[PDB]
Design an enzyme around this catalytic site. Sequence first.
Site, PDB file in Angstrom:
ATOM      1  N   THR B 262     -15.739  11.624 -10.633  1.00  0.00           N
ATOM      2  CA  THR B 262     -16.759  12.011  -9.664  1.00  0.00           C
ATOM      3  C   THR B 262     -16.949  10.928  -8.604  1.00  0.00           C
ATOM      4  O   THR B 262     -17.146  11.233  -7.420  1.00  0.00           O
ATOM      5  CB  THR B 262     -18.063  12.324 -10.385  1.00  0.00           C
ATOM      6  N   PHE B 387     -26.962  14.239  -9.587  1.00  0.00           N
ATOM      7  CA  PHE B 387     -26.790  13.571 -10.873  1.00  0.00           C
ATOM      8  C   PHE B 387     -27.513  14.288 -12.009  1.00  0.00           C
ATOM      9  O   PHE B 387     -27.833  13.663 -13.025  1.00  0.00           O
ATOM     10  CB  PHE B 387     -27.263  12.120 -10.784  1.00  0.00           C
ATOM     11  N   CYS B 394     -27.419  11.977 -15.176  1.00  0.00           N
ATOM     12  CA  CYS B 394     -26.299  11.043 -15.214  1.00  0.00           C
ATOM     13  C   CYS B 394     -26.759   9.643 -15.593  1.00  0.00           C
ATOM     14  O   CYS B 394     -27.537   9.021 -14.864  1.00  0.00           O
ATOM     15  CB  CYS B 394     -25.609  11.010 -13.855  1.00  0.00           C
TER      16      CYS B 394
HETATM   17  C1  HEM Z   1     -20.852  10.043  -7.980  1.00  0.00           C
HETATM   18  C2  HEM Z   1     -20.491  10.052  -9.264  1.00  0.00           C
HETATM   19  C3  HEM Z   1     -21.171  10.918 -10.356  1.00  0.00           C
HETATM   20  C4  HEM Z   1     -21.742  12.124 -10.278  1.00  0.00           C
HETATM   21  C5  HEM Z   1     -21.865  13.025  -9.031  1.00  0.00           C
HETATM   22  C6  HEM Z   1     -22.229  12.484 -11.591  1.00  0.00           C
HETATM   23  C7  HEM Z   1     -22.878  13.645 -11.935  1.00  0.00           C
HETATM   24  C8  HEM Z   1     -23.391  13.940 -13.177  1.00  0.00           C
HETATM   25  C9  HEM Z   1     -24.113  15.137 -13.552  1.00  0.00           C
HETATM   26  C10 HEM Z   1     -24.452  16.316 -12.612  1.00  0.00           C
HETATM   27  C11 HEM Z   1     -24.430  15.036 -14.843  1.00  0.00           C
HETATM   28  C12 HEM Z   1     -25.204  16.062 -15.687  1.00  0.00           C
HETATM   29  C13 HEM Z   1     -24.180  17.033 -16.267  1.00  0.00           C
HETATM   30  C14 HEM Z   1     -24.908  18.110 -17.027  1.00  0.00           C
HETATM   31  O1  HEM Z   1     -26.165  18.166 -16.915  1.00  0.00           O
HETATM   32  O2  HEM Z   1     -24.248  18.910 -17.748  1.00  0.00           O
HETATM   33  C15 HEM Z   1     -23.927  13.780 -15.343  1.00  0.00           C
HETATM   34  C16 HEM Z   1     -24.051  13.302 -16.627  1.00  0.00           C
HETATM   35  C17 HEM Z   1     -23.433  12.187 -17.153  1.00  0.00           C
HETATM   36  N1  HEM Z   1     -22.685  11.272 -16.434  1.00  0.00           N
HETATM   37 FE1  HEM Z   1     -22.310  11.351 -14.464  1.00  0.00          FE
HETATM   38  N2  HEM Z   1     -21.936  11.444 -12.451  1.00  0.00           N
HETATM   39  C18 HEM Z   1     -21.288  10.466 -11.717  1.00  0.00           C
HETATM   40  C19 HEM Z   1     -20.824   9.263 -12.189  1.00  0.00           C
HETATM   41  C20 HEM Z   1     -20.830   8.845 -13.494  1.00  0.00           C
HETATM   42  C21 HEM Z   1     -20.377   7.567 -13.990  1.00  0.00           C
HETATM   43  C22 HEM Z   1     -19.793   6.460 -13.078  1.00  0.00           C
HETATM   44  C23 HEM Z   1     -20.542   7.554 -15.321  1.00  0.00           C
HETATM   45  C24 HEM Z   1     -20.224   6.436 -16.345  1.00  0.00           C
HETATM   46  C25 HEM Z   1     -20.357   5.140 -16.076  1.00  0.00           C
HETATM   47  C26 HEM Z   1     -21.119   8.819 -15.700  1.00  0.00           C
HETATM   48  C27 HEM Z   1     -21.454   9.222 -16.969  1.00  0.00           C
HETATM   49  C28 HEM Z   1     -22.237  10.305 -17.311  1.00  0.00           C
HETATM   50  C29 HEM Z   1     -22.734  10.637 -18.630  1.00  0.00           C
HETATM   51  C30 HEM Z   1     -22.453   9.822 -19.918  1.00  0.00           C
HETATM   52  C31 HEM Z   1     -23.436  11.771 -18.533  1.00  0.00           C
HETATM   53  C32 HEM Z   1     -24.169  12.524 -19.662  1.00  0.00           C
HETATM   54  C33 HEM Z   1     -25.595  11.989 -19.719  1.00  0.00           C
HETATM   55  C34 HEM Z   1     -26.308  12.580 -20.904  1.00  0.00           C
HETATM   56  O3  HEM Z   1     -26.425  13.835 -21.005  1.00  0.00           O
HETATM   57  O4  HEM Z   1     -26.784  11.781 -21.755  1.00  0.00           O
HETATM   58  N3  HEM Z   1     -21.275   9.583 -14.567  1.00  0.00           N
HETATM   59  N4  HEM Z   1     -23.293  13.141 -14.300  1.00  0.00           N
END
Ligand code: HEM
EC number: 1.14.14.1
Lengths: 444, 449
Positions: B262, B387, B394
């Site tokens: 992402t 996010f 996120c």
């Molecule tokens: C611009 C970059 C990113 C975007 C747009 C983004 C977007 C998102 C979104 C929309 C979710 C929620 C998904 C859902 O509700 O089903 C999410 C969850 C998550 N993201 Fe990202 N993300 C980004 C970068 C990252 C990075 C760099 C990491 C790790 C270092 C990461 C790790 C995670 C994790 C572990 C979750 C799950 C959180 C949980 O439910 O406990 N993401 N992200």
Amino acid sequence: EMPQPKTFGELKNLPLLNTDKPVQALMKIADELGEIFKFEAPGRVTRYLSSQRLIKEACDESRFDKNLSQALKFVRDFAGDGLATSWTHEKNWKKAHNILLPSFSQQAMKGYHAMMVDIAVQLVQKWERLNADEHIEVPEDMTRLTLDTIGLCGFNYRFNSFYRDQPHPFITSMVRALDEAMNKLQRAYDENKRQFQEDIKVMNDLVDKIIADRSGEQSDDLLTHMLNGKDPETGEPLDDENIRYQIITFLIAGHETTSGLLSFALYFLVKNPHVLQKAAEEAARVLVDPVPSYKQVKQLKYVGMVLNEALRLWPTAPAFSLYAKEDTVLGGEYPLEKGDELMVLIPQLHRDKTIWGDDVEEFRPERFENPSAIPQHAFKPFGNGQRACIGQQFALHEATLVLGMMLKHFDFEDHTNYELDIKETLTLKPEGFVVKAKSKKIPL
Amino acid sequence: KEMPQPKTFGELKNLPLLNTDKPVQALMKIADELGEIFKFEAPGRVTRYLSSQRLIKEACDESRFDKNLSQALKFVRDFAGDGLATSWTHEKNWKKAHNILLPSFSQQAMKGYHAMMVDIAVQLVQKWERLNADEHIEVPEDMTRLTLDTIGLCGFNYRFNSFYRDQPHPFITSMVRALDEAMNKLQRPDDPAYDENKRQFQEDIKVMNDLVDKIIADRSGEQSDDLLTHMLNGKDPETGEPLDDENIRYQIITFLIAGHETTSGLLSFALYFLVKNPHVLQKAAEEAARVLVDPVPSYKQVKQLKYVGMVLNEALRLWPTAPAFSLYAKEDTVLGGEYPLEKGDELMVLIPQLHRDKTIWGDDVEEFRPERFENPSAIPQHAFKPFGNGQRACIGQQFALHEATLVLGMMLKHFDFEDHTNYELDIKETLTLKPEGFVVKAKSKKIPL
Ligand code: HEM
Ligand code: HEM
């Protein structure tokens, strides 16, 4: 060698507290000297902590226990061995703690909710009934609400503060007594003693009278549990004298800190209109009934974030004291001997830039988006450990309910462009804070 | 009351509408035709796509809705397991890992990661400094090299060394093939024709598992400033338990997936919009030159790149690279006062459509204007959700934004950029979004490192 502020000869640092705003003066000292400084007085030594690094160790209950600061020792002259002014090793603390804890749970708030709404409706009705161009004295009205709420939810007594200007004879004695306790920290005084003892008798006479009055009737209040509750550990109930000290303690601790929180919360809302709009939006979307339910108040997530951010910047019980249980080294650099005292400067802890970032002075409820994101012992508006605030859920439920109803029913205007002026007793409040409310004409 | 629904295909209902190379963009076009909510039915599946802030603000009420595992996420769970992103909120391992991993992902914890972020960012700058005249840059390819190496180094002290390669790591070969199979299974029965697809899928899972568990066993006992340390040594304050080794492997795989793709899309879209809006690029390049006064950017200097951060948020507005998340109703409830839902009913949040809500953003929603984010607090609640939402938001948001701000700031400080092909935006869809074939030319400003 530990940092220490300027001295006054034989008086050491004591004259630094000869001011109307000692907490705020201590915060400025913490800004100058850093995470820890020593404060010396004639026959008194303590160390003020301001960083999460040192406060998290101080909150280790195996190494430190709650200390009665000099303020709390003076409050004990009329609060006795109530929960807030008793030592952990005193039999009456754990006894009252076990007896009173089930009456302060989140589950127990369901029973208090109806009486909380009773007073909250009175506040809304008062503001609905103001004429055009009239304004609201916010801390005065918030104190009317929180005092009446703890009176009704606690002991089924109606102070009827919304029917008065001169507050209750009990309340007049309480503020004068707390004022004397504060003055003895900064301090011909023969008249003060006659005044102090008269105010103690007024509080004792009303309280002991209501205890004797409460007939055998059963109510949904703290007094019922205190009269009938038995400590599971000792098997003993509280005696009537300690019950009176608990009443005084809950009347004091149950109203003023909460009124300060609501006052500071409304201040930050009118100073941050985007935050106010988000909070008013949630209130309108969640509070769909003329009277809020218990479940609806628990749904006000953003309002609760507003209150926590208000508690971050201006925690209304701004400090607590600890003593070292044994010889120990804090943070690896300042050795402490058994009995050495520590003060936690909560407003400074809440401005620790290594925890919160550099924008610590900005009001952003979004800091509390994820409660788990906040590091351990970084946010301590309700104290620490087993000596933490027993009434935390009570204060937060009342404040969320009231602030939610305020935002649902009125638009608010900072018509004077009020300049924040924090009056210090033993708690904090924004003195002279006034607003105008424009009714949204939503019936109750 | 009666919910809109796109065209149907007999017994297949709406499912063939997703039998396309660009399903998110197809869903966005459907939302344009049908409005703030439409029903989407498949054999044995029903969900409702939300596009307005009016309805999504209710869906983001955590007392009424919880994160649902969409059909895509369920297939990702086959190799991401009960990692943070593919676990249910009610699973013990979610809150456990959530409490353990949040202290390594704060904005404050980025100070420890900053040096390793600079390591990879300098490699990117050096690569572009060393290009010959008339040579060009394959933007999403190089952005992916950067974000993968950054999540490798700050996360697990492992160097993918992507700037030394053309053919990527065998882990990634396993990963992208796995994500493609998971996407493809949405259209599919388990008949014999797919036996080879399963045999291939399991081979890709083993490669990821073999690399990850080996490094876990390798990590020696040496102490590092990375995610792996917290996973091996951190204990949940609630349960008092640390993560077991099996869940740790799922978190690593999750962080390798979610930690790079992402973010690379974000940098690619951001650079795309910059070269398409030269006045915005000049304003962003001016800030970079004014703020980044040292050969290496400091952590505090990156926090000063306010306009660069605005550029990234506006890029996330138009093309959020994780374009949707799923929710389910915790109890019976009424959405928007007109659509009753029963317990367990599913919702999909179409983030790109939410970010084009004209009642929130105005009429010029398709224009790239970072000035929308001058004061982020002005944006209403639940109007900007790149996010996710609530406790399931996120965890790496601050990691992605710090890395992207640092890198984009250095890019704008060191190079002038030319859209030499007049590139036509072509958004490739895997489970994320990226501008396929986006290429630029960079003219060095000759500022040493
Ligand atoms: C611009 C970059 C990113 C975007 C747009 C983004 C977007 C998102 C979104 C929309 C979710 C929620 C998904 C859902 O509700 O089903 C999410 C969850 C998550 N993201 Fe990202 N993300 C980004 C970068 C990252 C990075 C760099 C990491 C790790 C270092 C990461 C790790 C995670 C994790 C572990 C979750 C799950 C959180 C949980 O439910 O406990 N993401 N992200
Ligand atoms: C926002 C409002 C409140 C704040 C900021 C607050 C703050 C605090 C703090 C910091 C302490 C620990 C003091 C120390 O360690 O010396 C404490 C203790 C205490 N508070 Fe509060 N409080 C609030 C509301 C209430 C209410 C509404 C009640 C009564 C219903 C209450 C009753 C008590 C009691 C009894 C203790 C002593 C607990 C013990 O040691 O057993 N407080 N409070």
